[PDB]
Write a protein that binds this ligand. Sequence first.
Ligand SMILES: Cc1cc2c(cc1C)N(C[C@H](O)[C@H](O)[C@H](O)COP(=O)(O)O)C1=NC(=O)NC(=O)[C@@H]1N2
Ligand SMILES: Cc1cc2c(cc1C)N(C[C@H](O)[C@H](O)[C@H](O)COP(=O)(O)O)C1=NC(=O)NC(=O)[C@@H]1N2
Ligand SMILES: Nc1ncnc2c1ncn2[C@@H]1O[C@H](COP(=O)(O)OP(=O)(O)OP(=O)(O)O)[C@@H](O)[C@H]1O
Ligand SMILES: Nc1ncnc2c1ncn2[C@@H]1O[C@H](COP(=O)(O)OP(=O)(O)OP(=O)(O)O)[C@@H](O)[C@H]1O
Lengths: 362, 362
Amino acid sequence: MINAKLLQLMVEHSNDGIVVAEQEGNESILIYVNPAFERLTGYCADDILYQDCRFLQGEDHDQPGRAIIREAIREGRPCCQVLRNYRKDGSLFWNELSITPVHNEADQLTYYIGIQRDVTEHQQTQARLQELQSELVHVSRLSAMGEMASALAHELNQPLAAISNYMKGSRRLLAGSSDPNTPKVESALDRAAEQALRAGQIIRRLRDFVARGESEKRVESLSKLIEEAGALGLAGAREQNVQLRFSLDPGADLVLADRVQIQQVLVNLFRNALEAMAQSQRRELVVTNTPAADDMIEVEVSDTGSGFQDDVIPNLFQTFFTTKDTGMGVGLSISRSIIEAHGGRMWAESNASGGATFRFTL
Amino acid sequence: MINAKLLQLMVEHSNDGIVVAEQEGNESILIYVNPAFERLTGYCADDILYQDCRFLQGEDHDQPGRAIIREAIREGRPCCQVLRNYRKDGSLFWNELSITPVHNEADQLTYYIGIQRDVTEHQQTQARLQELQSELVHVSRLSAMGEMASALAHELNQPLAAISNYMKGSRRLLAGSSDPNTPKVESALDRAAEQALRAGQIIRRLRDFVARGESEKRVESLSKLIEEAGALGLAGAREQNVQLRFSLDPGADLVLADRVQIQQVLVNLFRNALEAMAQSQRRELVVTNTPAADDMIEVEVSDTGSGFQDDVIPNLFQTFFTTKDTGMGVGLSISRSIIEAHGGRMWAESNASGGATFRFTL
Ligand SMILES: Cc1cc2c(cc1C)N(C[C@H](O)[C@H](O)[C@H](O)COP(=O)(O)O)C1=NC(=O)NC(=O)[C@@H]1N2
Ligand SMILES: Cc1cc2c(cc1C)N(C[C@H](O)[C@H](O)[C@H](O)COP(=O)(O)O)C1=NC(=O)NC(=O)[C@@H]1N2
Ligand SMILES: Nc1ncnc2c1ncn2[C@@H]1O[C@H](COP(=O)(O)OP(=O)(O)OP(=O)(O)O)[C@@H](O)[C@H]1O
Ligand SMILES: Nc1ncnc2c1ncn2[C@@H]1O[C@H](COP(=O)(O)OP(=O)(O)OP(=O)(O)O)[C@@H](O)[C@H]1O
């Protein structure tokens, strides 16, 4: 096979944590650890040997991985779990633990071999991603409701005002009369007019119910929010072989923006480019920042997608104009309103590759 | 320094893959593998020994992990990466590989120890989660706009119809009189009524523009979609010490549903329960499905959160009613409309633990 002592050496000098324990009733006493386990746990070998690892949980006793591992050890099946542990210094970390029970026949004794890895970075990144998910969902819901309400307010402000004007006109016409049915009819109009007024107020009410979304701005790094937005919006990039190119300038990264609003602008651009790029020979998405003019900096996002026929391009930012069967046509309108609220100007043009290049300034 | 021979046995009988290779210039020849590696690769020891793992890469040569591993091994740093490999049958799997180089001083030779895990399930689950996240965002925007349109339609159906009826009444009342303005007024009223009708139609138009999501029915298994919904809504469970209990029935898996709509209903219930249970000493969430009645299956989700005071309970399902500053009061309204559109029954109750129990049927 392999020189056993060399195997001991290789196990001792590994970077991943390796432990050997022995079964004693309800205890799993440690009989061997490697220096990687020392650096990971922050304890010395002589302090911890011939105890059970339960102490690594500290005061955090009620974790399900504990019961899962207890049952797996009882039944004798190997298992993989994640637990919350604390080192000697008291710092928290997450431990990926893979236990394999083995029955040594030479001793007729049950032992366990445990592989441990420090997965704190992975869990932290997962938490950041889920936080991004929650806030992206919330602000997308807000922007959708707001644009729907504003469009309804306009499209109903026209006929409602028309109705009120017809009421005023008919009343003015009937005022020049003395017939018996005129008063009654007149009163009737008033009732209708009364209701009419309410409708308008109601609209504004619901309108101001959707406009209570906060409009703050803060100093934000463009690099960070570009990475967060790529992490969110670029699901299909791996599967659809999308070539990413970030042409960034480190001296011009900080803009005054709400990071979630810029995230949703970029998310919308990414979703649109990947959806458009379903049938494209070249699949390359480039994001670039450049100085543009008058102390403002321009961000460009270019794709090689299906592009726009000539009749479509000047209708892009209009609310509810859509090309996709499953679209809604509010993404670009909301994005443009966000960019303009930030003091910039956003526009689009066809690219030489037959796809599309979008630009905005901050 | 402990037993040493016993150790070789412990490594041989591990469930995780463990390999030892030796450096040959720029090559890493395999000199020891464990039966776990055989099970992982589907190859025999005599078949696979004394080569370099490269081959397990198959035809997938242009992966970044290859260059990362080459640079780390050349420079001498240990590293952990993920690669795509193929077994003997040609099936693809993903390998999480942790390599640690060690310089044996007794021989003055470079060896490597490699920990291998089959991490295909994790990658697949993450890809499914990202797809679910994308569709969740899309349909949340969709449902938000739809609910806003339906709420405005509800709150305006009274005054619009009232105005139109007052117009019809005024027209009947004035019809028959002998006055100079009567003909004109008549036409005017009609025009006004016309406008009113148009206004109503407009709302439905915009409503039906967002309601063009397909209204399909399903065969999907509830166990799977419950796990998917937990994957989206129950991220914080590990970090917030939430106790999960899934009481599932293999006999009660088929429901009549639109899968994206049930995804969003469950996501909303999960988010709401975690939000309510943020400050709770006892935190327990139970989801259970059973054959109740009406040839339909009922799913129950109960929590022990802060709950609702008695004056709130009958206001839960009202659109736009919210308690939390970061809420919107549309989650429950959308959930109710989805359940009623699907033919089901939705309800709520206070729990004995002070929390909340929600029920639905499918
Ligand atoms: C070989 C081996 C290795 C480990 C562990 C167990 C065995 C047998 N454990 C588990 C822990 O030692 C207890 O087995 C666990 O708490 C279950 O026992 P209970 O407290 O339920 O009796 C690790 N649990 C940890 O918290 N950290 C570790 O790194 C430990 N690794
Ligand atoms: C100890 C050890 C263990 C492994 C591996 C390498 C070492 C040193 N590799 C990497 C692979 O064998 C090549 O080293 C890799 O392709 C880099 O070498 P290049 O082709 O750049 O020369 C595994 N790569 C795999 O495809 N699967 C494995 O399980 C291999 N495990
Ligand atoms: N990269 C692109 N290539 C081609 N057309 C695009 C591109 N980006 C936007 N468009 C055009 O803009 C329209 C609206 O896109 P927008 O993202 O604003 O809304 P939508 O995609 O229709 O729906 P959603 O609200 O889900 O995004 C698309 O239907 C398409 O006509
Ligand atoms: N299980 C529950 N636990 C606690 N509160 C609940 C529960 N179910 C409903 N509620 C109450 O319902 C109200 C609105 O919930 P709903 O999810 O519909 O909207 P929201 O939580 O205010 O925000 P959003 O609409 O964005 O979800 C809140 O006041 C909330 O306290």
